[PDB]
Design a protein around this ligand. Structure first.
Ligand SMILES: NC(=O)c1ccc[n+]([C@@H]2O[C@H](COP(=O)([O-])OP(=O)(O)OC[C@H]3O[C@@H](n4cnc5c(N)ncnc54)[C@H](O)[C@@H]3O)[C@@H](O)[C@H]2O)c1
Ligand SMILES: [Zn+2]
Length: 325
């Protein structure tokens, strides 16, 4: 009917996507083990506490709700944690995804929207990064996201599963209306850390390098507003509903953002400066990484509409002890 199973739906991007689904008349059903997400963020439909590795419980859930699509956000997502603890990432991201895909095929639950990462590309050859770019990830996090992408392809071949894999770099901002935000502990993402530091919730923001080959010398990365991510994941649902073919596309603005720009923007919009501690650049670290969004525009009709820096900063700031002036 209109149930959409949002796996990992108690987390940052998943909860925003559940909110959006409900706005478009779907009934999001959240399946989440609350390991890093929050029960209080499940505000737009039913909640099933459970682990995606609990295959009986996941199958039971799919049988009860007969979802028209499954959106898979349920993963371990931290790069540095993945180098030191690869076990966690192979278990959650490869084992967990296989359990989810088995639950899907065994219940004839057909449409899977997979939240992937541009970390699958590793170091690229040209900028911006097109989907044709080789995928040579350089850490277990990127590795395990790539494995899930290929597992999706193999399950499509064998079982006729239909899917859209969505690749992006950095989820940012928060819901425009202010009641839903990014709550991680530890918080490892750049814009939240910079804001926490400006707010005095962190003492410093260590920034590694001011001598990159970039306009202001600080490194450039790719940021997309979480509401835009919600929009794309639901468009992906529509795509498969309308008998669309399997897809793997990048999500983003097509334009990068430097650390300096972010720090400057925060100081300007909140009146509080970020206490930056500039450290030596790490050798072999890329000056710029950002994705080519053209294919998503073509295949999904998707453009970002909330991912200007000012909107990202303005909507996130109130969640980290700052005020927009
Ligand atoms: N945040 C980003 O910048 C970013 C970038 C690229 C990709 N992604 C992908 O987005 C998805 C979630 O991102 P988030 O940033 O919202 O992280 P998040 O941790 O806020 O949400 C993750 C959710 O998954 C749940 N979960 C984790 N393992 C589970 C399991 N085994 N069984 C059931 N529930 C489980 C957690 O409790 C949490 O609610 C992940 O797939 C992540 O790789 C995020
Ligand atoms: Zn975070």
């Amino acid at each position: 009917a209109n149930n959409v199973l949002v796996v990992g739906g108690a987390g940052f991007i998943g909860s925003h996507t559940a909110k959006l689904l409900a706005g478009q008349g779907y009934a999001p059903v959240v399946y989440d083990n609350l390991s890093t997400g929050h029960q209080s963020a499940v505000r737009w439909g039913d909640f099933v506490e459970g682990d995606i590795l609990d295959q009986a419980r996941l199958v039971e859930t799919m049988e009860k709700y007969a979802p028209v699509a499954v959106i898979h956000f349920a993963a371990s997502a931290y790069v540095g944690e993945s180098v030191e603890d690869p076990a966690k990432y192979y278990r959650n991201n490869v084992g967990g995804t296989q359990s989810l895909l088995d639950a899907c095929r065994l219940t004839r639950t057909q449409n899977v929207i997979f939240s992937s990462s541009c970390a699958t590309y590793g170091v690229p050859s040209r900028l911006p990064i097109g989907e044709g770019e080789a995928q040579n990830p350089i850490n277990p996090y990127g590795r395990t996201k790539l494995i899930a992408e290929h597992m999706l392809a193999d399950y499509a071949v064998a079982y006729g599963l239909r899917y859209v894999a969505l690749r992006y770099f950095n989820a940012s901002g928060a819901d425009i209306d202010g009641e839903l935000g990014e709550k991680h502990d530890p918080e490892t993402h750049l814009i939240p850390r910079a804001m926490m530091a400006a707010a005095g919730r962190l003492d410093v923001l260590e920034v590694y390098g001011d001598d990159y080959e970039t306009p202001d010398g600080t490194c450039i990365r790719d940021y997309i507003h979480v509401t835009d991510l919600a929009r794309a994941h639901v468009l992906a649902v529509e795509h498969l509903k309308e008998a669309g073919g399997n897809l793997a596309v990048n999500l983003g603005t097509g334009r990068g953002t430097s650390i300096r720009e972010i720090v400057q923007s925060i100081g300007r919009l909140t009146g509080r400066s970020v206490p930056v501690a500039m450290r030596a650049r790490r050798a072999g670290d890329p000056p710029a990484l950002y994705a080519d969004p053209a294919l998503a525009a073509e295949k999904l009709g998707f453009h970002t509409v909330y991912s200007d820096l000012d909107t990202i900063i303005r909507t996130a700031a109130p969640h980290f002890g700052l005020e927009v002036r």
